[PDB]
Design a protein around this ligand. Sequence first.
Ligand SMILES: Nc1nc2c(ncn2[C@@H]2O[C@H](COP(=O)(O)OP(=O)(O)O[C@H]3O[C@H](CO)[C@@H](O)[C@H](O)[C@@H]3O)[C@@H](O)[C@H]2O)c(=O)[nH]1
Ligand SMILES: Nc1nc2c(ncn2[C@@H]2O[C@H](COP(=O)(O)OP(=O)(O)O[C@H]3O[C@H](CO)[C@@H](O)[C@H](O)[C@@H]3O)[C@@H](O)[C@H]2O)c(=O)[nH]1
Ligand SMILES: Nc1nc2c(ncn2[C@@H]2O[C@H](COP(=O)(O)OP(=O)(O)O[C@H]3O[C@H](CO)[C@@H](O)[C@H](O)[C@@H]3O)[C@@H](O)[C@H]2O)c(=O)[nH]1
Ligand SMILES: Nc1nc2c(ncn2[C@@H]2O[C@H](COP(=O)(O)OP(=O)(O)O[C@H]3O[C@H](CO)[C@@H](O)[C@H](O)[C@@H]3O)[C@@H](O)[C@H]2O)c(=O)[nH]1
Lengths: 406, 406, 406, 407
Amino acid sequence: MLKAVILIGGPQKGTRFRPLSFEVPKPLFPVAGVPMIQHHIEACAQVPGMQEILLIGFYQPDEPLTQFLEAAQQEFNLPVRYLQEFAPLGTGGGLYHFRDQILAGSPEAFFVLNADVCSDFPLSAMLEAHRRQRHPFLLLGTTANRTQSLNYGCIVENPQTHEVLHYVEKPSTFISDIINCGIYLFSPEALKPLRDVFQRNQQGTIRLEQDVFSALAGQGQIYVHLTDGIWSQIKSAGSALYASRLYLSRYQDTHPERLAKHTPGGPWIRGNVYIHPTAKVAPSAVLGPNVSIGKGVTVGEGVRLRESIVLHGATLQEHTCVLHSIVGWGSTVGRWARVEGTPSDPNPNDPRARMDSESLFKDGKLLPAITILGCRVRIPAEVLILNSIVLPHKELSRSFTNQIIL
Amino acid sequence: MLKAVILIGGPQKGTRFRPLSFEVPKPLFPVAGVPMIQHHIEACAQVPGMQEILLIGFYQPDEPLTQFLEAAQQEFNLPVRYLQEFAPLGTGGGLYHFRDQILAGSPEAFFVLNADVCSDFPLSAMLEAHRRQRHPFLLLGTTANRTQSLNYGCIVENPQTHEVLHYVEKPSTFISDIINCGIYLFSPEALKPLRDVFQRNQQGTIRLEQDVFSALAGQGQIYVHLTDGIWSQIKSAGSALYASRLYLSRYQDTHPERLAKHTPGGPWIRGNVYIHPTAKVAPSAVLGPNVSIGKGVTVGEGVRLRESIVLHGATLQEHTCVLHSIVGWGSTVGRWARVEGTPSDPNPNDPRARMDSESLFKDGKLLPAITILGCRVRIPAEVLILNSIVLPHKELSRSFTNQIIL
Amino acid sequence: MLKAVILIGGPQKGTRFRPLSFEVPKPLFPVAGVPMIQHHIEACAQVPGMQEILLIGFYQPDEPLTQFLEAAQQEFNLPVRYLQEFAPLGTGGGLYHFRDQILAGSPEAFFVLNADVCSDFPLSAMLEAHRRQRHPFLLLGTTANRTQSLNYGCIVENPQTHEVLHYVEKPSTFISDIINCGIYLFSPEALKPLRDVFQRNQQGTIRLEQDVFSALAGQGQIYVHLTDGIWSQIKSAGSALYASRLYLSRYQDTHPERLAKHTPGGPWIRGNVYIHPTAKVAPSAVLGPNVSIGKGVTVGEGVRLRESIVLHGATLQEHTCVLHSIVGWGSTVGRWARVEGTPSDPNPNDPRARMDSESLFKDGKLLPAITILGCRVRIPAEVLILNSIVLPHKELSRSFTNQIIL
Amino acid sequence: MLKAVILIGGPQKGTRFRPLSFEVPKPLFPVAGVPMIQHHIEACAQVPGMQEILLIGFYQPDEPLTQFLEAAQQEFNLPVRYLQEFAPLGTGGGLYHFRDQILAGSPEAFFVLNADVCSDFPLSAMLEAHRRQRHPFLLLGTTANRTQSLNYGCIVENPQTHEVLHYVEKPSTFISDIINCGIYLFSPEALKPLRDVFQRNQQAGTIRLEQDVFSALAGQGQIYVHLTDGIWSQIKSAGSALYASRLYLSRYQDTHPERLAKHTPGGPWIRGNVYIHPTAKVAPSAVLGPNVSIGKGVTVGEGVRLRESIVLHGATLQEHTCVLHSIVGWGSTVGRWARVEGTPSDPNPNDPRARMDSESLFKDGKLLPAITILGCRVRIPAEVLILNSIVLPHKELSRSFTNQIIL
Ligand SMILES: Nc1nc2c(ncn2[C@@H]2O[C@H](COP(=O)(O)OP(=O)(O)O[C@H]3O[C@H](CO)[C@@H](O)[C@H](O)[C@@H]3O)[C@@H](O)[C@H]2O)c(=O)[nH]1
Ligand SMILES: Nc1nc2c(ncn2[C@@H]2O[C@H](COP(=O)(O)OP(=O)(O)O[C@H]3O[C@H](CO)[C@@H](O)[C@H](O)[C@@H]3O)[C@@H](O)[C@H]2O)c(=O)[nH]1
Ligand SMILES: Nc1nc2c(ncn2[C@@H]2O[C@H](COP(=O)(O)OP(=O)(O)O[C@H]3O[C@H](CO)[C@@H](O)[C@H](O)[C@@H]3O)[C@@H](O)[C@H]2O)c(=O)[nH]1
Ligand SMILES: Nc1nc2c(ncn2[C@@H]2O[C@H](COP(=O)(O)OP(=O)(O)O[C@H]3O[C@H](CO)[C@@H](O)[C@H](O)[C@@H]3O)[C@@H](O)[C@H]2O)c(=O)[nH]1
């Protein structure tokens, strides 16, 4: 018997992902058609013997969250429950504070998953290593580029014994090539170190990486497990496009019916394209690679979309070109209007990619990134939105280039 | 009998050059301690025979606005009402649509005041000139620079009879130096030409400057009353701060009990400083020139505040320096933290410089201006915020420079 | 060219519709599957030459209302605008205040409807009756029971010239059999008497029935039109069920595809039943007469529904019996539960029908009426709810009988 | 060092026997001028060595609750924290789930309080009688009527050793003459039996305190009683809220003699015990009867009679109104010559120990006459009578209603 704990953030952790997030929490953002935590829930429900799934966060319950829970319970034939912390307790304080709800039923091991990561989720292979070793902490890790590894948690391991010799969290200088994926496997004895940290804080927030993983490393408690599958973290609004591309390329092996076929009677389609069944697409339109269409989306007659997410309720009139952009809920694009962005993804393996910054401006000028359109944005006809971020419920009158429209 | 009509805007029409407040309406933004239209309401209540005050604008009636109306009605002992347009009808369209509510009671004349101007309001002088000549339109006029005049509406007049011979609205070329100040006096005959404009629109929305003033100019219907006192327009954040400086310097002649005295036992005050009675300022704090403190603000030990505006409920901890910045309500600044902005101001060599306002991006580069902190923004300890706009409900963790922090 | 003005109420008028008015506004409550003003809009759009439909009411434009406007414009190919009053101006004060928007384009005539009536809407026949006489006010009137006529406004008419000699609004004692149907037809200078009332109020709210109709009665200005078609008014929660019965019986003449077919595969159907296409009904279920089913409704095995409205999102489990009840949005009825009401139709021809007081209690006992279940009300298994009103977001544990659950 | 735990409820678990507060949460409803739990917090401030106050309950945190928390924190010089359960965990499950936050700082004993009781709060006397024997559970208990004790939880006590031998929760038959107050004193080891109950459930983690812990440990030397004679009623419905406001206003003359309004011949006429907020503007022709509370910003007109009422903040009574036995919600307006009346059931006058029972809305399928509730922003027109009636919020009336619930 195993269960899974998905750490979703609160409303403050979603402020980095703020322009898109006003309408819905960051874990309920539709990445490649389905919500972000739904990939985690589905990959946990595909594991044999999963009894329950608990979501630990400090979001207040509203209709999006509980509607998602009521949908996912009947979809995956599993109880999906939401435990709410009273305060922001850190990454590990929420795991320790709900220890009775986690250990209820006495599970043999429980997974712990960050909500922001888009990954392969090879939970079965981690389970087959964990049944071989039966050790308190198992960490999914992956190799990253030497300049990109400084932003993630670095793990120095011994290659023969698969054990964390050392752990440094977001180091200033180079430590190791392997990074922490943010997916862990916990034994039931793994709540015994966390408890000690709680006692040390009184003589009630526990950060899992900086307190548990750093001190426990090298003493035989923490073991690594390396995957070579796809991994990325969704920390910003423009990283959701790259994670959606990763999921749409992953979709061939898992869900071949989700990607749209070419359909020579219907709209021309190149690359991997997800189209929702409710979405009305004109047959004159062509959809380039890595494109997701939401439910109830009307796409006009002659429209080009490439590397773009069109959220649900949005409306694209005819003759428009949308490259590298996220069109929010109910947003309207007038005819002959181009909405462009420049490609930029975390891409830890790659050296060219600009690494994580909360800044967004280099020296008083906006960095080239993914164009975001918030909720209910009315773009007029024959107008260009290039490299630009538009706040919700804003109608534009002329063409904006490289600006944030407040 | 006279009433006065204040043209408060709508939410879309504000389109702030720097957003002084993301969550409160622009006409309720506290300039020099009291809300922006409370200056208009008070200067209108000083005029003899003022029966009523109307506010025309298409804001939806949120409880802050109605609560302000509750306060102002019993403060000035005048009925203050809010008439909401059904749609954005333009500057003069809302006057014509609500002609039955303004004309009821048969006023002798009625004022029309823009909500965004910060002025002397010499309404009695305009009333004396209007009682002398009884002409239908009276316009306040001010003298401006040759470069700065292209932003306002220029007025060419006959200098002897003080009648407008030509009017032009934001011209591309230089026309005249006198600018319209957004303060007018309307005789009851003056709703008759507006009606004429409405019929030409059928062959809804009437722009008062472009359709009434710029068409009837020279035909003996529009007269300009020149004036001398302080005038600025509250378009952006920096112009709001400069208007607050103008009102704090004006307070010496009218409300000497509003400015904080020197008070050697309490906190140090240089220059003109408004401190609310409910705000508790530590006696080691020193508040520089042109500083407004709101209700419930707890300015800590050792704080320096220069050229700032602190909204209600913000807390500043020990040893913090706040220069040229607007602090949103409920915001927390940690100890040794510095919030700085750049005062664009007005030229010191120009004879009549009117302090222009620029919309956030010079030529595709973000320009340095007043630092805006949103509502409930937590600035952490020992950190620097420089030339930044911080969106609400965001807790920072590192120093930011020349950035819009989403 | 004709126009049509529908006086939807405000939030003050929907209070007599409280259980169902907490979630949606009153004019958007679905009567016989479609919203209450959709019947008005479709019967006005079937009239040839109709240009525009205006809705006058002091509701705030919430996203349900604006979403209905956007949907109705593209459904009926007719522009539907919503003109919002600044204050509650009565039945005719809003018609006078928006006179320029109503008379825009010089329409030949414009209908005036009340949003709460449920009727045949024979606007074509009223137009043909209008075009011969060409009089300012054309009133629709029907025959009613002498007991029931004291609740509606009464019209004493001349049989020879079809003219209102006498009008009494809500009479104490009996005056005439004919009652006002709440549908009017207005000629262009019929707004000229209305203006006179405004001037008489200056020594501006205009009640249309008491100030205009009762004053102009007998002066040759008001004319009657007599109808035999179906008519009811929806003033209360239980009146919407009777109006749904009348509209489902009217559907056979106009929209025979909306009624559900008997269906060998489908649930046994007697009488008039509307089922939405998205709704899912088990084959063992049986839906009796006058039953409307909303979208997304899951009806379990062996359910019996008779004279009930099941709004959208509601789930009824197995073997449940529901009679004379209104099931709220997302309200859940557990298995074997019986939700029963007693029929209290308004029915102005019927002599023993109730007076439609808003009292709901006779002498401390709740009168038998329709069983309203609020929005998101969960009913447990094997629990009877008889003649009750359940407020929204409630969860019950035991059987209630003749009670308001607060 | 002590701390105190106040078990405020949640929205659903109340099931208010008369729906007094349609949008203000039940702990924050003002009883005798200040909020209902503030009387707890004030009393918990007077105990020496009191560190913290924890409010455990499953209301979502929003503006009225957190505004009250900030105001009470800066007023009483105490840290007041709100701990929120994820689900309704019941009376003892709240104390078990948040046990790390309760035991932090190692308190020597902690008080547990029901939030709906209006009481004397004799916390220091309980503390002395606890320190003499040092036992895990100490229960405040009072004497009650023989037929009225079936609503409360009854306690069978040994008179010599002051120990419970049998606790029954809301019994049908008669059990004992002593009832549980809802004020408890817990040892640090008092969380040790609670854990046992949690383990017994594993062979939503919800522990009812009174039915599991107290009815299991009874007669084993764990639970002891403390008998008091001071004032006690439980604020379950609206009528008991008026009676609790009366008890607190009569008790105010010892603790807070400055809160009751004086007779003040220059100001309004006052008989009985009246609380008047400083912001409230009352004309001098108004005469305010006994047991009347006035919230902040209330403008009471000329000639207004107010008897046995509670007027929440921002209400407006125009001239010549008469308001008896009713609760006027916040922001609501009553026009001139309008009479708003109710009927107070009270306690039996003959019975020697009679407490107010909070009857439900319906006696026998019919509405029983009780206190008149006006919701918030209710506009009562001029010259109209509301009698024994409940008006839902944001309603405008035009005629006189009697014995009705107006939706
Ligand atoms: N319950 C709870 N959950 C939280 C909290 N704070 C964050 N979470 C969730 O915890 C996960 C990570 O939290 P972060 O603090 O934002 O860490 P990070 O900057 O994203 O980096 C972590 O994950 C990376 C991979 O995504 C790792 O590479 C890195 O080492 C570290 O583990 C996210 O799902 C976040 O929503 C909290 O206070 N309480
Ligand atoms: N009711 C209503 N009011 C409006 C609307 N649009 C603007 N207002 C209000 O009308 C005032 C001026 O509107 P603008 O159209 O933005 O004028 P401007 O660019 O600011 O310049 C005007 O004022 C200057 C001084 O402030 C003048 O110098 C200039 O001539 C012009 O009149 C502002 O307070 C604005 O809030 C509207 O559609 N409806
Ligand atoms: N815009 C606006 N609409 C209003 C207002 N007040 C009422 N309405 C709308 O006006 C219509 C009737 O208003 P009532 O005042 O409640 O009249 P009534 O009790 O329904 O009786 C009227 O209608 C009956 C049939 O519906 C008639 O039988 C009767 O004669 C009378 O005309 C309803 O659609 C209501 O929503 C208002 O202040 N503003
Ligand atoms: N944290 C939390 N608190 C709760 C919960 N449910 C109720 N409370 C609070 O616990 C207190 C009592 O809970 P009840 O279950 O309603 O008990 P009761 O019917 O009022 O009777 C109790 O109190 C009486 C006197 O107040 C006692 O006579 C009786 O013995 C019993 O203890 C009230 O403050 C209630 O708000 C809950 O699920 N979680």
